[PDB]
Design a protein around this ligand. Structure first.
Ligand SMILES: COc1ccc2nc(C)c(O[C@@H]3C[C@H]4C(=O)N[C@]5(C(=O)NS(=O)(=O)C6(C)CC6)C[C@H]5/C=C\CCCCC[C@H](NC(=O)OCC5(C(F)(F)F)CC5)C(=O)N4C3)nc2c1
Ligand SMILES: [Zn+2]
Length: 197
């Protein structure tokens, strides 16, 4: 009982810069500092942007700010706190049935606006700053216009699907693959986020 360990916090280790005309990933913290920060839960780094790259001790994925909430997947974050300048921050949303968790958006982040366009021409942003066109096929499904191996999508759960105007349409959750080729993606629709709020 006295030897029971405590799981570390999720740690922001970078971001996907969507500011200019070129999307590109930036790293803000290395492996060693990530491990240190996950154990203390103290992260003094400045946060910027909409899409964060986050990591635990064993997994790395994405987290996206929408309406002042940093959203990500439960299968990445579990019930973990997130590191912040003042210590670990407890999740304000947890829904395992949706594979969804959320924390208050970090100070300095920018939030995407929920989409009300009703458009089916979407764009998935990956951890490698690829902007993949995706056609919406259902409430929670979309097909890649250019299929590719699932390797290129691994580590991008928690990333956004965006409409043509840059609104948040959903959060990337799972990949539909055949023979290792991702033909479609499963995502948490922004409306499901809005009802959880
Ligand atoms: C524990 O408590 C919970 C509660 C609810 C929950 N709900 C889920 C739907 C779920 O799914 C698992 C994780 C997800 C994934 O890996 N997601 C990423 C991703 O990148 N993760 S990650 O960032 O690398 C990582 C692991 C660090 C965090 C985007 C994928 C990228 C590549 C796929 C790799 C092969 C996998 C193909 C697989 N496909 C699929 O399950 O098909 C189903 C389905 C669908 F419609 F798609 F839902 C009916 C057809 C898939 O995508 N899985 C498997 N786990 C949970 C767990
Ligand atoms: Zn829109």
């Amino acid at each position: 009982m006295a030897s029971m360990k405590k799981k570390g916090s999720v740690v922001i280790v970078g971001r996907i810069n969507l500011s200019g005309d070129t999307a590109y990933a930036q790293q803000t913290r290395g492996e060693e500092g990530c491990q240190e920060t996950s154990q203390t839960g103290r992260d003094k780094n400045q946060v910027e942007g909409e899409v964060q790259i986050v990591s635990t001790a064993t997994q790395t994925f994405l987290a996206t700010s929408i309406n002042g909430v940093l959203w990500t997947v439960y299968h990445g974050a579990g019930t973990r706190t997130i590191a912040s300048p003042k210590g670990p921050v407890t999740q304000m949303y947890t829904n395992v049935d949706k594979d969804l968790v959320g924390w208050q958006a970090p100070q300095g982040s920018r939030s995407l606006t929920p989409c009300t366009c009703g458009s089916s021409d979407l764009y998935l942003v990956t951890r490698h700053a690829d902007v993949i066109p995706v056609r919406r096929r259902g409430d929670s499904r979309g097909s890649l216009l250019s299929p590719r191996p699932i390797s290129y999508l691994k580590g991008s759960s928690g990333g956004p699907l965006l409409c043509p105007a840059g609104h948040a349409v959903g959060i990337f959750r799972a990949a539909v693959s055949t023979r290792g080729v991702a033909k479609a993606v499963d995502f948490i629709p922004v409306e499901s986020l809005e009802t959880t709020m």
